[PDB]
Amino acid sequence: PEYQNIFTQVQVQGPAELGVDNENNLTEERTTGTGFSQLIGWIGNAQLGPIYLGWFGIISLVTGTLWFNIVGFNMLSQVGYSIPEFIRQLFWLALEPPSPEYGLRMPPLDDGGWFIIASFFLLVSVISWWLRTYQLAEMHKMGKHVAWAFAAAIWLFLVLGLFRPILMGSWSEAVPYGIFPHLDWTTAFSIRYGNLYYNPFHALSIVFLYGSVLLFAMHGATILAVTRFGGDRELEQIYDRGTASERAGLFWRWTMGFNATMEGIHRWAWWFAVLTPITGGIGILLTGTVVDNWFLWAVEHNFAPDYTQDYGYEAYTTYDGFLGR
């Protein structure tokens, strides 16, 4: 069959690229030293590094390391400092949020103090990383779309961790730091407040997540289809339209009656991805503070389905018949 352009047939290697520069002097903070990976060269680029080391990055790294070490050492101490038992129960341990009886006051170290300290460190680290991603775009002379799309997810992060506990007046409304405990928190939160399926904003966030996954599948397939016309060089196609863009647009116009441009599809992708955490945070912020039962809300607003048939196994079969006796 024809070449499908999933793996590269032959690789070439030249002198390492150090990066572009301007009067802002990005070179003064970049590291020296690069590597090449032939295993990754089958899919993408082979050069590894260098990286830019500012102050926001160092602060974020140190503070996130502190949070990681606090959580890990608390989990280790909870098991008796036994390394085999620490390894055995790794997925089951956690650092629990404070008890409901303490409200918004600072709890003791045994019942949530370390949780608050680690949460403060994690918040500082995340904000430092966001500031770094803004500063890099400001110094290379580019737009700030990356910072906005990160802020989109930071919004849901903050809603799940900071704003909602303050609105509900308790530090016990946060999420524990664990693998299985956090899934347990998800399920318990869903059960406690009715059914989260009947929250309209959860449905909207699900809609946008599905749309975003569908849109990347479509765009990846489309770009790999027209790569024989140099379709992967999107910027030059935007500045000077070629046949690849025309064919890509005509495919979708003949398929579903409307199409896009080489620059407009990226706007669609940006918005579908960004709209998910925003709707999710808006929906989460209204739970408990405004609505306490979502199934009752749906019933009162008349979009809860009704069933006619009966309940129970004895209405459909027999216990002996099920066993085959």
């Binding site: 016309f229 407009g264 405004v290």
Partner: protein, 255 residues
């Protein structure tokens, strides 16, 4: 919590506000994507009576690098072809077109190319982006099979020549083109093949798109050390047109 009227509460207000915002956002997104290809035309080249429910957007300006000027969209079509050898198969709209001469030589159908600028694409330094491997210092093969020196087999099992060079992308360290030296029987000079249409084996390189007799009419580059966007388009599309026009059985229904 209480309700403003009836069953209307804060959640309903948020939902309706989101409805309005989403409607406006959909309008904006659809209008932003109408900067190329408008206004619509009929099959005779005249402006159609129907133009849709979305009006055209306003103008935006792009400032290009290397002193190439500015681009304003939406505007006139500068990539339009002038004289196409095509024939209508019906008196109204909605029916296909019939090639007048040789579709592979006339650049129609799957062999169509766009009238791009007749200048090479430049990298950050202002050098041509795609350069032959014999003029790039410090570049070498690091993995895979080296295709240089191997014979080239066409789509019908004919050997036309040997691979003599590769044209690489220095900025991104990727191979773009494979150069071919033709035997005197099958033509003269050298031709380029894009890397996306070849299959390198241990003893041969196969091009299934076109046959042996179609190799002498591949468009040639004017300069031996660089290629322009227009030439790349014509070369690359000529190679794509063979998937349909290289044989009569590729055009008729497969059933």
């Amino acid at each position: 919590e209480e309700t403003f009227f009836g069953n209307f509460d804060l959640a309903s207000l948020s939902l309706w506000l989101f409805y309005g915002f989403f409607a406006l956002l959909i309008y904006y997104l659809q209008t932003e994507n109408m900067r190329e290809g408008y206004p619509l035309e009929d099959e005779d080249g005249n402006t159609a009576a129907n133009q849709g429910p979305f009006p055209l957007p306003k103008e935006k300006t792009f400032k290009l690098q290397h002193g190439r000027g500015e681009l304003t969209l939406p505007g006139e079509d500068v990539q339009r072809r002038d004289n196409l050898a095509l024939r209508k198969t019906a008196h109204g709209n909605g029916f296909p077109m019939e090639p007048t001469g040789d579709p592979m030589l006339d650049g129609v159908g799957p062999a169509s190319w766009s009238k791009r600028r007749d200048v090479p694409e430049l990298d950050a330094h202002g050098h041509p982006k795609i350069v032959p491997m014999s003029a790039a210092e410090g570049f070498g093969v690091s993995a895979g099979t080296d295709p240089r020196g191997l014979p080239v087999m066409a789509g019908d099992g004919e050997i036309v020549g040997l691979v003599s060079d590769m044209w690489i992308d220095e900025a991104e360290q990727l191979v773009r083109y494979l150069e071919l030296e033709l035997d005197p029987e099958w033509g003269d000079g050298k031709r380029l093949v894009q890397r996306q249409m070849v299959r390198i084996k241990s003893d041969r390189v196969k091009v299934r798109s076109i046959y042996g007799k179609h190799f002498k009419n591949v468009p040639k580059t004017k300069s031996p050390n660089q290629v322009t966007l227009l030439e790349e388009d014509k070369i690359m599309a000529y190679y794509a047109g063979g998937t349909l026009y290289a044989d009569e059985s590729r055009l008729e229904p497969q059933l």
